């Protein structure tokens, strides 16, 4: 038959289900970024696990190793582009020092609230999911949309959104005309 379509998991649950230190710390992390469920912490922890793992193997290789050199900058360049890694920390050693708070800093929901487009972090998600935030000329309703630096300055309301010069919404037309 047809060739199989590859897919992979993006999150993993901890081996120990009930650890009050981890249970409250995740709530401290999830609560003030307004993440719906712990799986999004798992997804960041899962991705950060393999970013650290990838850099670990390169760091074990010799200096001036062609594989370390080629993959070292490409991995670092991909992090500097998304704003997670500072431009001065291009050493593959600060990559391991990265923390899940930096990745949650680059989310669309996080940036929309931090740019003043929303009253709270919770207002950012409902504003995003209702098709109001547009990145450049493209409407995005994915709260987990990671922001590249070249797109940080372009975060605004949709031009057709009722909050940014679009048509009046459903409730407005039902009330203003009755």
């Amino acid at each position: 038959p047809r060739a199989p379509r590859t897919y992979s998991k993006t999150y993993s649950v901890p081996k120990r289900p009930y650890e009050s230190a981890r249970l409250d710390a995740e709530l401290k992390l999830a609560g003030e970024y307004g993440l719906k469920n712990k799986r999004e912490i798992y997804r960041i922890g899962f991705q950060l696990s393999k970013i650290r793992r990838a850099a670990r193997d390169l760091l074990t290789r010799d200096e001036k190793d062609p594989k370390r050199l080629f993959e070292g900058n490409a991995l670092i360049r991909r992090l500097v582009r998304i704003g997670v890694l500072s431009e001065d920390k291009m050493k593959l050693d600060y990559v391991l020092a990265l923390k899940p708070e930096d990745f949650l800093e680059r989310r669309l929901q996080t940036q929309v609230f931090k740019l003043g487009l929303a009253r709270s972090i919770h207002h950012a998600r409902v504003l995003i999911t209702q098709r109001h935030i547009a990145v450049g000329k493209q409407i995005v309703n994915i709260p987990s949309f990671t922001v590249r630096l070249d797109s940080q300055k372009h975060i605004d309301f949709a031009h057709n959104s009722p909050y940014g010069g679009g048509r009046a919404g459903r409730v407005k037309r039902k009330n203003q005309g009755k």
Partner: peptide, 14 residues
């Protein structure tokens, strides 16, 4: 439910 319940758990114990 969900995210709003997730808010309810954060504000109350922290």
């Amino acid at each position: 439910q969900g995210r709003a319940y997730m808010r309810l758990l954060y504000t109350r114990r922290f």
